[PDB]
Symmetry: C3
Subunit: 252 residues, 3 copies
């Protein structure tokens, strides 16, 4: 499953013109249908432009970088109007706009209800995308859907950073496996339990017959903090060790 | 304070049907009220559906993962219509939708103006959420607000990475505290001053009577770069040291 | 170029009141114009309020932190109405709202079509921003655009983390440049090739006549994983080494 962006209300829509508000982009979702009552008008089953020319469009946008894998278009559900061809333009940085496939005119609908779907390989990578109807039956009227790849579990992570040292002579003597634990509080509590990555930025340690032995481990990670377990073994004397840590929260 | 999402214009809204555009979701914010003039209609003080059945809804969405802590609903301000019960559905990945509390029918409004608030513990974690009115007085008409936790200071950070080495024999001789500074330019200038985290990925150093002594510090961090101060002391000779750095910008 | 936020459909808009849906915020973009046909009304070339008082507004919002560098306003294109002064309020956390320049009344339009632009130095840093018309000619009617800095290449990166060790005695003997490669699969495949940053969190190694020599390198990075090349040289015997890695994907 890809994501149906309009169905999920993921994108802002902006048309060039509307026939009136009862023909607005709010009425443009694929398969949109309203009351079948012939005595009261509740709006077109489509966006319909006001101006009929080759310069009309709907822009769809949001802040996220989307990978668009398809677009589907359909005509108007309640009257004989539909877009028969269009062009597509898009932008990643919202400053520089590009023409899809050098301004290819894409062949579109030929009736009220049949769905015509264009697939993108590779995906169009964009923050905003615009459909530009070029030809039409009766009126520039359409329904549509944009399909994007779902967001990855690893996207938009939250991050907190710090440093942690032994800070005393706890590991500076003795024999065999020896550890000390420093408890670290994150500056702010996370909403779920992060992972904690660590890297050494100071070693002050004595070899044991030429062998250096030191290790750091992040352990007992909660939303509030974690334990840096400093570890030596054999007969090494560790005077101090310092780690920077990067705590990363996913999915929140 | 939680965030009033509609008040702050944080979510796109999409209804199943509207009575017409003058009854659209744009009119649905909690406590919405317009001109009290009886001679001109400026729109309902509510969203109102067009179709009256058990299949109508408003979807609210955006790209961010929200933690919804409450929903409030209210009836229509200018006419005797209000939703008396509803269901809620939501989605995190915008592909898979779930029914809140196994499709619990929530008891809602009984007049025009009184606010009925449902609290979520734990918070509903979602990109999009849909209210599905089930029963109503007169018409499916509502006002509403969604309340989410505020965004954390640590969310959506910007990141730049690199590596930095001594690259010569500056630290390879001498006695006592000795340092050298390498200035590092970020590939692109940040908008505010980042933190810089560092971890060692190369040691080429001589012990001093068995003691190893090396340290790296990021210092003098600006929007443009920072100084990696490489440090040794006692009588160690450091031939080379290499750090990877992770520069993180928050709040921008 | 800064970003034209409304042109690019980047922000949700919410007005206090609309004269009706045919005067809604959907009609408010700078230079908006529709059919010049005098016989059919397709909507005002502006947002127009319904209530005329000092309490009307449009809020523009989305989840991203924007750096607003300018606002432009214009009157109504199709009738003699325009906003002659306004105030601005904004919010970063969507809980706490601030008044721009202590509630400065900004002098605005004096006709239908001329654009009046206010520049912000420093940029207003905000998730949502509201224009509050204070005085007007004929009606509270406006067109507008908000201009923000473009998003940086380094924003909203995706991140994956892990750890990698030699895990055997491959580097524990021998002379001269010696390496072993551990291949690392990311828990999930990236959409483009990430950078991989590394930091050491365990050293178990023997000096060679007092010299310590160890290095780690991330190499052959693909969307699926990378190689950690563990390196020693001279005559050092490395028993084990462990790195945490941070893989960062940009622009996706
Ligand atoms: C204590 O005996 C072993 O010595 C080895 C070096 O020869 C490594 O340091 C091992 O980790 C250690 O357990
Ligand atoms: C120079 O005397 C001290 O020696 C110690 C080892 O015994 C540590 O290395 C200290 O950092 C150092 O200051
Ligand atoms: C092998 O001879 C050299 O020895 C030096 C120490 O004196 C450093 O370790 C160099 O990297 C190494 O190449
Ligand atoms: Ca109908
Ligand atoms: Ca009214
Ligand atoms: Ca007109
Ligand atoms: Cl070391």
């Amino acid at each position: 499953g890809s994501v149906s962006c309009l169905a999920n209300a993921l994108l802002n829509l902006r048309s060039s013109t509307d026939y009136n508000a009862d023909h607005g982009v709010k009425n443009s979702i694929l398969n949109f249908s309203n009351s079948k009552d012939a005595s009261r008008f509740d709006g077109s089953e489509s966006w319909s432009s006001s101006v009929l020319d080759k310069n009309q469009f709907i822009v769809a946008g949001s802040d996220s970088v989307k990978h668009f894998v398809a677009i589907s278009t359909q005509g108007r559900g309640d009257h004989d109007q539909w877009v028969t061809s269009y062009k597509l333009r898009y932008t990643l940085d919202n400053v520089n706009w590009v023409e899809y496939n050098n301004g290819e005119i894409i062949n579109a609908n030929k009736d009220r209800n049949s769905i015509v779907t264009i697939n993108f390989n590779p995906p169009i990578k964009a923050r905003s995308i615009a459909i530009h109807p070029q030809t039409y039956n009766n009126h520039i009227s359409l329904r549509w859907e944009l399909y994007a790849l779902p967001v990855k579990s690893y996207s938009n992570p939250s991050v907190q950073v710090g440093e942690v040292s032994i800070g005393d002579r706890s590991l500076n003597s003795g024999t065999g496996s020896r550890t000390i634990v420093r408890h670290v509080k994150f500056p702010v509590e996370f909403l779920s339990v992060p992972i904690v990555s660590i890297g050494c930025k100071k070693v002050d340690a004595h070899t044991d017959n030429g062998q250096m032995r030191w290790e750091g481990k992040s352990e007992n990670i909660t939303t509030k903090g974690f334990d840096l377990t400093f570890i030596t073994w054999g007969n090494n004397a560790v005077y101090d060790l310092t780690f920077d840590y990067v705590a990363v929260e996913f999915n929140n």
